[PDB]
């Protein structure tokens, strides 16, 4: 019945009690179409973003927010808003911006608009606490994070449910990559502030903590030269 009353009574979050064709072909064609993983160690604050070419069809942007380290370099929304994301986005392209659950819900929307996108979806990462039943401004206990989807230019649900990670673990659920990939938005996919642990076929990962690089702009571009320029990433 009333799982909010139940959460006040016991500490089990209401999302703990959520239970539960073949989109396997998509994921198999994604796999056949995927470029080899490419990755580059770069201090994105000090890095000229324009050296990342060609323009990207998808950008996953995962700035390290201070709120991700409650009991544990952080980027402020001031830092984030100054990234020249519009300079590397293809004229039709998508962004997925992890915004946290505080002021990023507002400041990440300003960012999207600043870079020329309109928000078309709000993906919520709902964190369960089955294994362990505040911000000054908070009215409620925050048990979720938001990933805003933005679109510029001309299957799945908007919820990801997983158990809350252990303290100090900042990873976002890898489910976000399946949502993005299931869209078939194109093959130039960029993950900014990725890590060694997030490197993935089909993606160029750029972040300060990577321990190795293999990126080469010419090699990277060769993946999308004719006849491969406009594949969705979901074809042969």
């Amino acid at each position: 019945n009333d799982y909010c009353q139940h959460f006040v009574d016991t500490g089990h979050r209401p999302q703990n009690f959520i239970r539960d064709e073949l989109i396997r072909l998509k994921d198999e064609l994604i796999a056949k179409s995927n470029t080899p993983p490419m990755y580059l160690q770069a201090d994105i604050e000090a890095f000229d973003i324009r050296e990342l070419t060609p323009k990207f069809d998808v950008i996953l942007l995962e700035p390290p927010l201070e709120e991700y380290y409650r009991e544990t370099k952080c980027w402020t929304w001031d830092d984030i808003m100054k990234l020249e994301i519009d300079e590397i986005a293809a004229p039709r392209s998508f962004i997925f911006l992890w915004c946290g659950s505080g002021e990023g819900l507002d400041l990440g929307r300003v960012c999207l608009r600043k870079w020329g996108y309109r928000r078309c979806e709000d993906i919520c990462w709902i964190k369960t606490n089955k294994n362990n039943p505040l911000d000054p401004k908070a009215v409620f206990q925050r048990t979720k994070e938001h990933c805003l989807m933005g679109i510029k230019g001309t299957v799945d649900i908007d919820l990801i449910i997983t158990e809350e990670p252990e303290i100090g673990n900042i990873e976002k659920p890898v489910e976000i990559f399946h949502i993005i990939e299931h869209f078939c938005l194109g093959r130039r996919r960029l993950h900014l502030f990725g890590r060694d642990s997030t490197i993935r076929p089909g993606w160029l990962t750029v972040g300060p903590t990577l321990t190795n690089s293999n990126y080469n702009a010419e090699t990277y571009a060769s993946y999308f030269s004719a006849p491969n320029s406009y594949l969705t990433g979901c074809t042969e």
Partner: protein
Amino acid sequence: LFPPQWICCDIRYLDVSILGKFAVVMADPPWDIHTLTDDEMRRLNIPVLQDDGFLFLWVTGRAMELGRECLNLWGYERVDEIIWVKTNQLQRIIGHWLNHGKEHCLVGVKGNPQGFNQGLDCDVIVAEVRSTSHKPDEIYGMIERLSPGTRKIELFGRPHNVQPNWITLGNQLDGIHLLDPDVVARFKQRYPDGIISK
């Protein structure tokens, strides 16, 4: 006071100054998505309703952004955002690109509210989709725990939304039903003949 109260009206034209101050405002507006125009929304006299307290603002589609605009326009800061996860009777989950499993409610604060029970509930609601456009009754429990006993006002509510401690405004309610003596006075002074027009 305490029992349900309501006013059938067009919220554009009611003089809400007669209603006093509320600890919580809730609104479920008929946003002009895919109805009140954006300008009518902006011009609602929300600011007279509270001095210190919270507003709960349901939003969808492009109103996620417009509702943020109105929120700040009316003098609030957004300090939380509640999502209702819509399930069936078996607790499974029931705007192109992605299917929608949830509805959003912005939470704004105005002034410096004191004596509220911040942090008793979490920002997720899991509840069964009853009727189309019927909001989950758990929100009233969260709101009551947050601010027990205080005066609350709902805008664009429906008859099933009338609750104790709440005044409900909407254009499909059954007449006027007011019991708070201060409200009844200022309503008589402002509307001696019982008609609401300009």
